[PDB]
Structures are given as C-alpha cells and as structure tokens.
Design an enzyme around this catalytic site. Structure first.
Site, PDB file in Angstrom:
ATOM      1  N   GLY A 122      -2.814   4.351  23.603  1.00 47.46           N
ATOM      2  CA  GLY A 122      -2.289   3.884  23.405  1.00 47.46           C
ATOM      3  C   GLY A 122      -2.090   4.562  22.018  1.00 47.46           C
ATOM      4  O   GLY A 122      -0.531   5.453  21.958  1.00 47.46           O
ATOM      5  N   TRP A 163      -0.105   4.824  17.512  1.00 47.33           N
ATOM      6  CA  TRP A 163       0.991   4.461  17.718  1.00 47.33           C
ATOM      7  C   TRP A 163       2.904   4.006  17.960  1.00 47.33           C
ATOM      8  O   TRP A 163       2.762   2.879  17.859  1.00 47.33           O
ATOM      9  CB  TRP A 163       1.272   4.607  15.920  1.00 47.33           C
ATOM     10  CG  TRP A 163       2.443   4.041  15.104  1.00 47.33           C
ATOM     11  CD1 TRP A 163       2.478   2.529  14.693  1.00 47.33           C
ATOM     12  CD2 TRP A 163       3.904   4.045  14.467  1.00 47.33           C
ATOM     13  NE1 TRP A 163       2.984   2.519  14.195  1.00 47.33           N
ATOM     14  CE2 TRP A 163       4.681   3.362  13.865  1.00 47.33           C
ATOM     15  CE3 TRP A 163       4.276   5.500  15.426  1.00 47.33           C
ATOM     16  CZ2 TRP A 163       5.659   2.533  13.865  1.00 47.33           C
ATOM     17  CZ3 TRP A 163       6.400   4.992  15.415  1.00 47.33           C
ATOM     18  CH2 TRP A 163       6.546   4.016  13.780  1.00 47.33           C
ATOM     19  N   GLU A 199      -2.077  -0.929  18.419  1.00 50.18           N
ATOM     20  CA  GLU A 199      -1.754  -0.514  16.873  1.00 50.18           C
ATOM     21  C   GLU A 199      -0.812  -1.942  16.965  1.00 50.18           C
ATOM     22  O   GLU A 199       0.633  -1.690  16.548  1.00 50.18           O
ATOM     23  CB  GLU A 199      -1.860   0.491  16.280  1.00 50.18           C
ATOM     24  CG  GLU A 199      -2.679   1.534  16.107  1.00 50.18           C
ATOM     25  CD  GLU A 199      -2.628   2.629  15.566  1.00 50.18           C
ATOM     26  OE1 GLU A 199      -1.475   2.952  14.436  1.00 50.18           O
ATOM     27  OE2 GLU A 199      -3.386   3.454  16.060  1.00 50.18           O
ATOM     28  N   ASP A 233      -4.711   6.100   5.891  1.00 47.48           N
ATOM     29  CA  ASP A 233      -3.357   5.246   5.986  1.00 47.48           C
ATOM     30  C   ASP A 233      -3.107   3.730   5.272  1.00 47.48           C
ATOM     31  O   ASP A 233      -2.501   2.954   5.448  1.00 47.48           O
ATOM     32  CB  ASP A 233      -2.787   5.538   7.261  1.00 47.48           C
ATOM     33  CG  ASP A 233      -1.914   6.657   7.536  1.00 47.48           C
ATOM     34  OD1 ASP A 233      -1.678   7.570   6.877  1.00 47.48           O
ATOM     35  OD2 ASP A 233      -1.194   6.594   8.248  1.00 47.48           O
TER      36      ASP A 233
HETATM   37  C1  LIG Z   1      -2.034   7.923  16.991  1.00 50.30           C
HETATM   38  C2  LIG Z   1      -0.864   7.846  15.566  1.00 50.30           C
HETATM   39  C3  LIG Z   1      -0.060   8.809  15.368  1.00 50.30           C
HETATM   40  O1  LIG Z   1       1.302   9.311  15.743  1.00 50.30           O
HETATM   41  C4  LIG Z   1       1.888  10.494  15.821  1.00 50.30           C
HETATM   42  C5  LIG Z   1       2.914   9.987  14.502  1.00 50.30           C
HETATM   43  C6  LIG Z   1       3.174   8.171  15.158  1.00 50.30           C
HETATM   44  C7  LIG Z   1       2.967  10.954  13.083  1.00 50.30           C
HETATM   45  O2  LIG Z   1       2.033   9.346  12.694  1.00 50.30           O
HETATM   46  C8  LIG Z   1       0.827   9.534  11.604  1.00 50.30           C
HETATM   47  O3  LIG Z   1       0.715  11.228  11.686  1.00 50.30           O
HETATM   48  N1  LIG Z   1       0.293   9.065  10.965  1.00 50.30           N
HETATM   49  C9  LIG Z   1      -0.847   9.358  10.086  1.00 50.30           C
HETATM   50  C10 LIG Z   1      -1.502   9.360  11.445  1.00 50.30           C
HETATM   51  C11 LIG Z   1      -2.152   7.500  11.469  1.00 50.30           C
HETATM   52  N2  LIG Z   1      -3.029   7.280  12.484  1.00 50.30           N
HETATM   53  C12 LIG Z   1      -2.964   5.739  13.666  1.00 50.30           C
HETATM   54  N3  LIG Z   1      -1.573   5.167  13.060  1.00 50.30           N
HETATM   55  N4  LIG Z   1      -3.589   6.139  13.974  1.00 50.30           N
HETATM   56  C13 LIG Z   1      -4.887   6.736  14.414  1.00 50.30           C
HETATM   57  O4  LIG Z   1      -4.831   7.284  14.287  1.00 50.30           O
HETATM   58  N5  LIG Z   1      -5.481   6.244  15.872  1.00 50.30           N
HETATM   59  C14 LIG Z   1      -6.224   6.935  16.455  1.00 50.30           C
HETATM   60  C15 LIG Z   1       3.861  10.062  12.326  1.00 50.30           C
HETATM   61  C16 LIG Z   1       4.125  10.545  10.794  1.00 50.30           C
HETATM   62  C17 LIG Z   1       5.153  11.387  12.958  1.00 50.30           C
HETATM   63  O5  LIG Z   1       5.418  12.328  13.009  1.00 50.30           O
HETATM   64  O6  LIG Z   1       6.658  10.055  13.667  1.00 50.30           O
HETATM   65  C18 LIG Z   1       7.477  11.038  14.707  1.00 50.30           C
HETATM   66  C19 LIG Z   1       8.301  10.359  14.090  1.00 50.30           C
HETATM   67  C20 LIG Z   1       8.735  10.215  12.266  1.00 50.30           C
HETATM   68  C21 LIG Z   1       7.430  10.441  15.958  1.00 50.30           C
HETATM   69  C22 LIG Z   1       7.039   8.954  16.186  1.00 50.30           C
HETATM   70  O7  LIG Z   1       8.305  10.712  16.357  1.00 50.30           O
HETATM   71  C23 LIG Z   1       6.074  12.039  16.556  1.00 50.30           C
HETATM   72  O8  LIG Z   1       6.453  12.743  16.421  1.00 50.30           O
HETATM   73  C24 LIG Z   1       5.599  10.959  18.411  1.00 50.30           C
HETATM   74  C25 LIG Z   1       6.947  11.449  19.280  1.00 50.30           C
HETATM   75  C26 LIG Z   1       4.803  12.687  18.170  1.00 50.30           C
HETATM   76  O9  LIG Z   1       4.322  13.072  17.578  1.00 50.30           O
HETATM   77  C27 LIG Z   1       3.391  11.841  18.804  1.00 50.30           C
HETATM   78  C28 LIG Z   1       3.501  10.436  20.159  1.00 50.30           C
HETATM   79  C29 LIG Z   1       2.909  10.735  17.493  1.00 50.30           C
HETATM   80  C30 LIG Z   1       1.743  11.128  16.540  1.00 50.30           C
HETATM   81  C31 LIG Z   1       0.945  12.597  17.749  1.00 50.30           C
HETATM   82  O10 LIG Z   1       2.918  13.025  16.217  1.00 50.30           O
END
Ligand SMILES: C#CCO[C@@H]1[C@@H](C)[C@H](OC(=O)NCCCNC(=N)NC(=O)NC)[C@@H](C)C(=O)O[C@H](CC)[C@@](C)(O)[C@H](O)[C@@H](C)[C@@H](O)[C@H](C)C[C@@]1(C)O
Ligand SMILES: [Cl-]
Length: 498
Positions: A94, A96, A143, A214
C-alpha cells in the site's frame, strides 16, 4: 524483559530497484549497505516498501519492476538477519500513493477485500509473495478503508493470519513466527473510519503501528506541530469525530470518552486506542517521523507556531520555487515541503538563518526562519526521550518510524531510540513529562482503578454518588436512584475494583 519493537520502514522506488547500486548515491541515495550491522541490531523490524495490489486483486510488485534486481535488493536486507536473530524483514502493501482515496490502485484494495473468494485469492497472494522473496511478515498500509469496506478488511486480515500461522508451522518458525501488522491512522478523523471495529482489526495483528505523525501539514489553515506528544493550549484544537462513530454508546459514555474540541496529539491517538475494549497496550506501536514538515509565509511572534501560512497543498508541487533555504534534498525531489532529519541537521548547522526552538508542552522541536517566515515541525533525539518514556509508561509495544533513509548518516535517531529502551546506563526516571494537555477520555477499555462503598439496596443515591458493585465502581447520572448498578440507564460504570 520483553524487548520493545523498533520498526523502520525501508522505501526504495521502482526506478532505483531497476538501477540498483551501492556506489552512487545520485542513483540510489540510501542503499541497503547503509544499514550497518550496528543498525541491524538496533532494529527489530524493517518494513520493505511498497508493494501493491494489482487489478487481478493480488499482492504484486509494481509491474515495471525488474524481478531479478528486486530479489537481489530483498536478499541484501534478509542477509542482515545474520547480525540479529530477532530481526524481521517485513514487506508492506500500500502506502499513500497506491492506496489513498484517489490513489492509483485504490479500487484494487476495495475489490480485493470485498468478497470471500477475493479475500482468499488476495490472502494467498500475500503469503506466496512473502515466501517467494524471503520476507518475514506482512504489513498493510491502506490509507484508509472506509466504514463500508471495514468488514471486508477485517475478514482479509483474519484470513492472512490463518495462512501465516500455517506457514509458521510448516517452516518450524515458532522461534520467529511470521507476523502481520498494519499502519493505522494516528489521528481521529481517519481513525473514525474503522474505530467502532477496532478490537476486530487489532485481533489478527502482532502490532498496529500508529501513524502518529503528519498530524499537521499544508492542508491546515494554521501551522502546527506534526507529532506533538501532548497538547498546547495556545495551539489549534479539533472536532473529535470519534464521538459520531457508530458505537451505540449513551451521551454520557460518548462525552466521557471523546472531549471536543481536542488537541490532535500522539497521546490522544494512543489513548483513543486504549479506550476500546479488546485493544491491548502491547499491540500498540507509536509512530514517529524521521522527517520535518515545512511551511512558508508564516508570521513572527511565536516562532512560526499556530500561524497562517502560504504553503501550497497541491500535488505535484506547483512550481520550481524551492524556498526551503538550505534543503538540497528538496531541490533533488522538487518539493520544499518535506525535509529529512538528515537534511535538517545540515540546514541548522549551516548559515541558513534557522533557529532551533522547543515547545515544552508538546515536547517537540521546531525550526523557525525569522527572516523569510519559515516553520518546520520535526522530531529529534530529545523529543524521542519523552516519547520513549511514554511508551514504557503506557506499556506500548514499541516504536515505528518513517523512514530509515531519513536518519542522519550515523543513524543517531535509531540509536537514540534503541538506547532509551535498552541501554543499562540510561535513566529517564527523573525526566519531566511536562504540563501539556493530556487526553482524558475514558472508555470501557481503560477504566481506572477506584474504590467506593458497596452499593446498599434500599439506599437513595443522589446525582454523582459513587458505589461499588459486582467488580466495578458506578456513578449515578441523576438522583435519586435505588436501582442496582448496571440494571438500568441511571448508572455509569466509571471504575474497576480490586
Ligand atoms: C507512505 C508514504 C509516503 O509516500 C511518499 C510520498 C507520498 C510523499 O508523502 C510523504 O512523504 N509524506 C510524509 C509521510 C506520510 N506517511 C504516510 N502517509 N504513510 C506512512 O508513513 N506509512 C507507513 C509526498 C510528499 C510526495 O512526495 O508525493 C509525490 C507527489 C507530491 C509523489 C506521490 O509523486 C511521490 O514522489 C511518489 C511518486 C513516490 O515518491 C513514492 C511512491 C511516494 C513517497 C514514498 O514519496
Ligand atoms: Cl516474536
């Protein structure tokens, strides 16, 4: 004598798997080799992340993934177990991006758990993937399931549990049994989606890893700490959504459990779990961020705290203004809104104009940049003392964090957590937990120990009178009552005896 869990996410994106290397941090910033033996010993779990659920409604790698490179990366992690026979390499399904209400794979999560045949197919796929790649357990980070999907989600955990237990028996793994966790909501608004059925969600798990971070971000009107341990009365407060959950409780029961408005804190989420009957404290794991959330456009006066702000909430970040002075990772990632702890150390150390400040209610640090109007909420080795002490005091299962690649090079955040739980010479008996606002909800799951005179038949009890009867302490909601406590709606169970 029971070791606290210390559960660290390891995230690596498909492109970095497919180009995997340990000798070029501009392709792979945080290779497996950065997890030294000393760090391997400090961890109890590594959650490899993320896998997905594809449209065949099975657990699957991203289809762009190179299978050989994936196996190789996973083997490097499981090799770490040679340094630490308690260590598990979980994998996590999973996140986000895949699973949020508008996520790319969202409907697959909804469909995978919908019917009994779909759950069988999904559950089997999880354990097959675990076995095929050498993992030690399954973590689900959806989520989040909405209230309608929650019975399916529960049944799917129950079915994965049963298959994991078969596999443990097959492989003679009673010394390190295959485990099932989820990443659970750490604030009331998302928690309310499944709160009423919390005991059922937690029953098949070894842990529920609360995402108690968060809790603030660009989506709020007002800057706030993302992971305050306790509340600050000067800070914003929120509607307690849990009071509208489908619990079937009375007005008094609901009022005494769910004060509103309330302070959206780590302590709130933990207490909100403990309030529920059948949710044991040992299965609850406190999440912490290894990153900060940054805001721009803030006003001075209170260190940037509780200020309006002009931080874009849109995804993707809507321009190339990388305004988080000193953050090189932000330029690399094209987003100034998140900075790793590693990076924040560097920002604070260089001449970038930040002060490190400390809120003694929330017991959390924050950066303030007075000249440009920037505010960053994050956690460090100091805030972790209070959080570790709270973990011990509340008899929680341990600590979880997102994510490993955001610790500094020496791994100081991980080391500090391991030290506060396990170091013989570390003493926090005098550490002062402060006068921040506690969450005071009481529910069926956390009645305090009380005493009172025994109920006496024939006695007329005024409003507020306290008696003891059949194992509990009871309180009249109005007067005058002569009924036996528990026999009608006039008595509130408030306490437990002896
Ligand atoms: C689980 C979490 C956070 O996900 C990552 C993003 C959403 C990232 O979100 C954050 O890091 N949130 C802080 C942690 C919050 N945690 C959780 N929700 N869950 C958790 O901790 N679970 C255990 C956001 C900002 C992003 O770059 O998003 C960009 C676009 C704005 C995005 C979606 O394109 C990302 O670039 C993605 C393509 C890629 O990097 C990965 C797949 C997503 C990731 C790891 O960076
Ligand atoms: Cl164990």
């Amino acid at each position: 004598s029971t070791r606290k869990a210390v559960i660290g996410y390891y995230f690596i994106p498909t492109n970095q798997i497919n180009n995997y290397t340990e000798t070029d941090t501009s392709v792979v910033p945080f290779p497996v080799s950065n997890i030294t033996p000393a760090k391997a010993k400090q961890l109890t779990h590594i959650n490899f992340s993320f896998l997905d659920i594809n449209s065949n409604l099975e657990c699957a790698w991203d289809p762009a993934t190179n299978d050989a490179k994936a196996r190789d990366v996973v083997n490097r992690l499981t090799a770490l177990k040679a340094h630490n026979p308690s260590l598990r390499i979980m994998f996590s399904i999973g996140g986000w991006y895949y699973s949020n209400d508008l996520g790319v794979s969202h409907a697959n999560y909804v469909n995978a758990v919908k019917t009994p045949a779909a759950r069988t197919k999904f559950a089997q796929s999880c354990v097959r993937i675990m076995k095929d790649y050498g993992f030690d357990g399954v973590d689900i980070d959806w989520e989040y399931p909405q209230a309608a999907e929650v019975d399916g989600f529960i049944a799917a955990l129950q079915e994965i549990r049963t298959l994991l237990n078969q596999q443990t028996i097959a492989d003679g793994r009673q010394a390190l049994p295959y485990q099932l966790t989820i990443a659970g909501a750490g604030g009331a608004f998302f928690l309310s989606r499944y709160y009423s059925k919390l005991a059922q969600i937690v029953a098949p798990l070894d842990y529920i890893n609360l995402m108690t971070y968060d809790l603030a971000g660009p989506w709020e009107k007002i800057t706030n700490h993302q992971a305050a341990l306790f509340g600050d009365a000067a800070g914003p407060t929120f509607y307690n959504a849990l009071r509208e959950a489908n619990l079937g409780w009375s007005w008094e029961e609901l009022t005494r459990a769910f004060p509103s408005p309330f302070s959206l804190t780590v302590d709130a989420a933990v207490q909100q779990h403990l309030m529920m009957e059948g949710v044991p404290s040992a299965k609850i794991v406190m999440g912490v961020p290894f990153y900060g959330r940054a805001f721009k456009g803030v006003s001075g006066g209170n260190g940037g705290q509780y200020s309006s702000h002009s931080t874009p909430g849109e995804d993707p970040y809507p321009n190339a203004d990388y305004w988080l002075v000193g953050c090189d990772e932000c330029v690399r990632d094209k987003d100034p809104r998140i900075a790793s702890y590693r990076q924040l150390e560097q920002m604070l150390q260089g001449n970038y104009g930040y002060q490190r400040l400390w809120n003694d209610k929330t017991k959390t640090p924050y950066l303030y940049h007075a000249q440009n109007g920037l505010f960053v909420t994050y956690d460090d080795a100091e805030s972790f003392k209070y959080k570790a002490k709270y973990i011990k005091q509340q008899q929680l299962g341990g600590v979880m964090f997102w994510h490993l690649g955001q610790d500094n090079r020496n791994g100081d955040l991980l080391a500090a957590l391991d030290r506060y739980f396990n170091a013989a010479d570390y003493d926090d008996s005098q550490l002062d937990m402060g006068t921040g606002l506690r969450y005071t909800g009481v529910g069926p799951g956390n009645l305090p120990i009380m005493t009172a005179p025994a109920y006496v038949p024939g006695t007329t009890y005024a409003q507020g009178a306290l008696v003891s009867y059949q194992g509990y302490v009871w309180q009249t909601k109005w007067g005058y009552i002569t009924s036996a406590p528990g026999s009608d709606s006039a008595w509130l169970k408030v306490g437990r005896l002896a």
